Motif scaffolding. Structure first.
Motif, PDB file in Angstrom:
ATOM      1  N   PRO A  97       0.822  -1.219   0.000  1.00  0.00           N
ATOM      2  CA  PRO A  97       0.000   0.000   0.000  1.00  0.00           C
ATOM      3  C   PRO A  97       0.862   1.278   0.000  1.00  0.00           C
ATOM      4  CG  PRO A  97      -0.721  -1.476   1.726  1.00  0.00           C
ATOM      5  CD  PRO A  97       0.372  -2.195   0.998  1.00  0.00           C
ATOM      6  N   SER A  98       1.860   1.315   0.870  1.00  0.00           N
ATOM      7  CA  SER A  98       2.785   2.444   0.923  1.00  0.00           C
ATOM      8  C   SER A  98       3.861   2.302  -0.144  1.00  0.00           C
ATOM      9  CB  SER A  98       3.491   2.558   2.249  1.00  0.00           C
ATOM     10  OG  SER A  98       4.425   3.647   2.180  1.00  0.00           O
ATOM     11  N   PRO A  99       4.080   3.366  -0.960  1.00  0.00           N
ATOM     12  CA  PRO A  99       5.160   3.307  -1.969  1.00  0.00           C
ATOM     13  C   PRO A  99       6.544   3.072  -1.413  1.00  0.00           C
ATOM     14  CG  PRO A  99       3.806   5.284  -2.245  1.00  0.00           C
ATOM     15  CD  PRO A  99       3.350   4.643  -0.984  1.00  0.00           C
ATOM     16  N   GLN A 100       6.820   3.568  -0.209  1.00  0.00           N
ATOM     17  CA  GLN A 100       8.126   3.322   0.380  1.00  0.00           C
ATOM     18  C   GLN A 100       8.321   1.891   0.873  1.00  0.00           C
ATOM     19  OE1 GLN A 100       7.979   7.230  -0.553  1.00  0.00           O
ATOM     20  NE2 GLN A 100       6.484   6.431   0.952  1.00  0.00           N
ATOM     21  N   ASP A 101       7.273   1.091   0.949  1.00  0.00           N
ATOM     22  CA  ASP A 101       7.419  -0.308   1.295  1.00  0.00           C
ATOM     23  C   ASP A 101       7.613  -1.215   0.131  1.00  0.00           C
ATOM     24  OD1 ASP A 101       7.230   0.175   4.021  1.00  0.00           O
ATOM     25  OD2 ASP A 101       5.108  -0.334   4.104  1.00  0.00           O
ATOM     26  N   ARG A 102       7.570  -0.630  -1.054  1.00  0.00           N
ATOM     27  CA  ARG A 102       7.681  -1.410  -2.275  1.00  0.00           C
ATOM     28  C   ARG A 102       9.152  -1.599  -2.550  1.00  0.00           C
ATOM     29  NH1 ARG A 102       3.456   2.434  -5.278  1.00  0.00           N
ATOM     30  NH2 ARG A 102       1.774   2.008  -3.770  1.00  0.00           N
ATOM     31  N   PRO A 103       9.552  -2.757  -3.034  1.00  0.00           N
ATOM     32  CA  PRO A 103      10.973  -2.905  -3.393  1.00  0.00           C
ATOM     33  C   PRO A 103      11.342  -2.059  -4.619  1.00  0.00           C
ATOM     34  CG  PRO A 103       9.719  -4.748  -4.213  1.00  0.00           C
ATOM     35  CD  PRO A 103       8.751  -3.926  -3.428  1.00  0.00           C
ATOM     36  N   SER A 104      12.608  -1.682  -4.728  1.00  0.00           N
ATOM     37  CA  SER A 104      13.070  -1.011  -5.921  1.00  0.00           C
ATOM     38  C   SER A 104      13.224  -2.054  -7.034  1.00  0.00           C
ATOM     39  CB  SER A 104      14.387  -0.314  -5.656  1.00  0.00           C
ATOM     40  OG  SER A 104      15.418  -1.261  -5.502  1.00  0.00           O
ATOM     41  N   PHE A 105      13.337  -1.589  -8.268  1.00  0.00           N
ATOM     42  CA  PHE A 105      13.683  -2.512  -9.328  1.00  0.00           C
ATOM     43  C   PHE A 105      15.058  -3.149  -9.086  1.00  0.00           C
ATOM     44  CE2 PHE A 105      10.512   0.138 -11.464  1.00  0.00           C
ATOM     45  CZ  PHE A 105       9.639  -0.855 -11.877  1.00  0.00           C
ATOM     46  N   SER A 106      15.990  -2.404  -8.461  1.00  0.00           N
ATOM     47  CA  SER A 106      17.313  -2.952  -8.159  1.00  0.00           C
ATOM     48  C   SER A 106      17.305  -4.062  -7.162  1.00  0.00           C
ATOM     49  CB  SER A 106      18.264  -1.868  -7.656  1.00  0.00           C
ATOM     50  OG  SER A 106      18.595  -1.047  -8.778  1.00  0.00           O
ATOM     51  N   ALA A 107      16.338  -4.059  -6.245  1.00  0.00           N
ATOM     52  CA  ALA A 107      16.063  -5.214  -5.369  1.00  0.00           C
ATOM     53  C   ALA A 107      15.323  -6.384  -5.998  1.00  0.00           C
ATOM     54  CB  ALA A 107      15.310  -4.745  -4.139  1.00  0.00           C
ATOM     55  N   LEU A 108      14.353  -6.093  -6.850  1.00  0.00           N
ATOM     56  CA  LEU A 108      13.617  -7.123  -7.556  1.00  0.00           C
ATOM     57  C   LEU A 108      14.471  -7.867  -8.573  1.00  0.00           C
ATOM     58  CD1 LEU A 108      10.501  -5.034  -8.432  1.00  0.00           C
ATOM     59  CD2 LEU A 108      10.398  -6.900  -6.867  1.00  0.00           C
ATOM     60  N   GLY A 109      15.339  -7.134  -9.268  1.00  0.00           N
ATOM     61  CA  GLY A 109      16.114  -7.732 -10.359  1.00  0.00           C
ATOM     62  C   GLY A 109      16.920  -8.956  -9.954  1.00  0.00           C
ATOM     63  N   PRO A 110      17.705  -8.865  -8.853  1.00  0.00           N
ATOM     64  CA  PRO A 110      18.485 -10.039  -8.440  1.00  0.00           C
ATOM     65  C   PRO A 110      17.626 -11.234  -8.123  1.00  0.00           C
ATOM     66  CG  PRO A 110      19.364  -8.087  -7.421  1.00  0.00           C
ATOM     67  CD  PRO A 110      18.147  -7.652  -8.157  1.00  0.00           C
ATOM     68  N   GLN A 111      16.442 -11.008  -7.563  1.00  0.00           N
ATOM     69  CA  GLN A 111      15.559 -12.116  -7.231  1.00  0.00           C
ATOM     70  C   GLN A 111      15.087 -12.795  -8.511  1.00  0.00           C
ATOM     71  OE1 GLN A 111      15.090 -13.246  -4.085  1.00  0.00           O
ATOM     72  NE2 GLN A 111      16.652 -11.684  -3.635  1.00  0.00           N
ATOM     73  N   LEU A 112      14.630 -11.998  -9.477  1.00  0.00           N
ATOM     74  CA  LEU A 112      14.162 -12.564 -10.719  1.00  0.00           C
ATOM     75  C   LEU A 112      15.339 -13.180 -11.476  1.00  0.00           C
ATOM     76  CD1 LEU A 112      11.899  -9.625 -11.869  1.00  0.00           C
ATOM     77  CD2 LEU A 112      11.067 -11.789 -11.077  1.00  0.00           C
ATOM     78  N   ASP A 113      16.519 -12.551 -11.388  1.00  0.00           N
ATOM     79  CA  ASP A 113      17.726 -13.100 -12.055  1.00  0.00           C
ATOM     80  C   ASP A 113      18.070 -14.459 -11.466  1.00  0.00           C
ATOM     81  OD1 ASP A 113      17.913 -10.872 -13.683  1.00  0.00           O
ATOM     82  OD2 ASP A 113      19.477  -9.852 -12.469  1.00  0.00           O
ATOM     83  N   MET A 114      17.997 -14.603 -10.135  1.00  0.00           N
ATOM     84  CA  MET A 114      18.223 -15.896  -9.469  1.00  0.00           C
ATOM     85  C   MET A 114      17.235 -16.968  -9.916  1.00  0.00           C
ATOM     86  SD  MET A 114      20.916 -15.218  -7.605  1.00  0.00           S
ATOM     87  CE  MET A 114      21.073 -14.116  -9.010  1.00  0.00           C
ATOM     88  N   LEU A 115      15.961 -16.592  -9.966  1.00  0.00           N
ATOM     89  CA  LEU A 115      14.894 -17.507 -10.384  1.00  0.00           C
ATOM     90  C   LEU A 115      15.051 -17.898 -11.860  1.00  0.00           C
ATOM     91  CD1 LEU A 115      11.943 -15.796  -8.528  1.00  0.00           C
ATOM     92  CD2 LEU A 115      12.920 -18.029  -8.000  1.00  0.00           C
ATOM     93  N   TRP A 116      15.317 -16.908 -12.734  1.00  0.00           N
ATOM     94  CA  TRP A 116      15.545 -17.199 -14.145  1.00  0.00           C
ATOM     95  C   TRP A 116      16.772 -18.114 -14.295  1.00  0.00           C
ATOM     96  CZ3 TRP A 116      19.780 -15.485 -17.233  1.00  0.00           C
ATOM     97  CH2 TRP A 116      19.779 -16.164 -18.478  1.00  0.00           C
ATOM     98  N   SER A 117      17.941 -17.643 -13.850  1.00  0.00           N
ATOM     99  CA  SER A 117      19.185 -18.436 -13.924  1.00  0.00           C
ATOM    100  C   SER A 117      19.067 -19.837 -13.319  1.00  0.00           C
ATOM    101  CB  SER A 117      20.347 -17.725 -13.247  1.00  0.00           C
ATOM    102  OG  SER A 117      21.554 -18.392 -13.531  1.00  0.00           O
TER     103      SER A 117
END
Ligand SMILES: N#C/C=C/c1cccc(-c2nc3cnc4[nH]ccc4c3n2C2CCCCC2)c1
Ligand SMILES: NC(=O)Nc1ccccc1
Length: 292
Positions: free
Chosen positions: A269-289
């Motif tokens: 709900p709060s924008p400041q609680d949302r992860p940045s794209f820089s935080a999301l990327g490694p997670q998705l990169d780990m899952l993809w890889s």
């Protein structure tokens, strides 16, 4: 002279690629030799354009020209000519079209691995935008292009805007037409846009990806189901209530638990609680890889 000036008289219209209320993207051949052998390009131009739309289009051009990413559609140049509304934006043409159509056409042969690849590429493109302080505001599968089966690029910068140097958000006046089911609640309610409102949109893109853009479980279709037998409540009003109650889109069957967790975080709900794209990327990169 520079390769970035395309002569208007040499641009030969072929077909339409996209349209909005105030502009269109057209497939054109740039054909200076006049023998129909020139390169194909995608050309944006305005229609029904007042000073505001023209000013935004100038902005769009200057933003796209300054971006150099593998996951953002390539600027090629401009064209112009006598009189007004003749300014054109020339871009690369991607004949495979948009990701929304690609997923619907090829659903049965695209596994979760490949969807994770797309997600990681889109996230990288949004990380790149974030570093340039650009809020895209139209992140949706219909605006993502397929370069090849394992390579996507972000398009449609018609609504993109730079943050000021001293503020991490901006505010618009109650605008023309938004894709309400892709937009952050603060954007909907108070016209506040930021990198974090783009993250919320990215979550809805993940939802699109892992439903293969199926129309029967589109966001709009899921909203209509979340509606009880009340059909005459304005959608925007009711969506805002549902989001405030903590209701969110369901986990798709193709969606790994980790990806559902990332969607939920994108929709904090709060924008400041949302992860940045820089935080999301490694997670998705780990899952993809990891699923390769
Ligand atoms: N949902 C849905 C359907 C989306 C759809 C359908 C047909 C064509 C396109 C399309 N092809 C393009 C190929 N090269 C391009 N270069 C820059 C934009 C561009 C292209 N666009 C769009 C992309 C979004 C902005 C409008 C043109 C998108
Ligand atoms: N972010 C999110 O969950 N949005 C939503 C919720 C219900 C229906 C349609 C869209």
């Amino acid at each position: 002279q520079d390769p970035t000036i395309f002569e208007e008289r040499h641009l030969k219209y072929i077909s339409q690629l996209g349209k909005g209320n105030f502009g269109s993207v057209e497939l054109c051949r740039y054909d200076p030799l006049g023998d129909n052998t020139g390169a194909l390009v995608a050309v944006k131009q305005l229609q029904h354009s007042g000073p505001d739309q023209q000013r935004d289009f100038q902005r769009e051009i200057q933003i796209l020209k300054a971006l150099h990413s593998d996951f953002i559609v390539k600027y090629r140049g401009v064209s112009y000519g006598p009189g007004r509304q003749s300014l054109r934006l020339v871009m690369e043409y991607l004949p495979s079209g948009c990701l929304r159509d690609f997923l619907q056409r090829h659903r049965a042969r695209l596994d979760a691995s490949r969807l994770l690849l797309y997600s990681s590429q889109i996230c990288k493109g949004m990380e790149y935008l974030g570093s340039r302080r650009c809020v895209h505001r139209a992140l949706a599968a219909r605006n993502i292009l397929v370069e090849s089966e394992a390579h996507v690029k972000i398009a449609d910068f018609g609504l993109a805007k730079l943050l000021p140097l001293d503020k991490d958000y901006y505010v618009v006046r109650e605008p023309g037409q938004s894709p309400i089911f892709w937009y952050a609640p603060e954007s909907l309610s108070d016209n506040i846009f930021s990198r974090q409102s783009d993250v919320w949109s990215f979550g809805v893109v993940l939802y699109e990806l892992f439903t293969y853009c199926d129309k029967s479980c589109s966001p709009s279709a899921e909203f209509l189901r979340m509606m009880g037998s009340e059909r005459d409540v304005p959608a925007l009003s009711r969506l805002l209530e549902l989001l405030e109650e903590g209701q969110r889109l369901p986990a798709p069957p193709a969606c790994p638990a980790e990806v559902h967790e990332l969607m939920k975080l994108c929709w904090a709900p709060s924008p400041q609680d949302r992860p940045s794209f820089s935080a999301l990327g490694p997670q998705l990169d780990m899952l993809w890889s990891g699923s390769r």
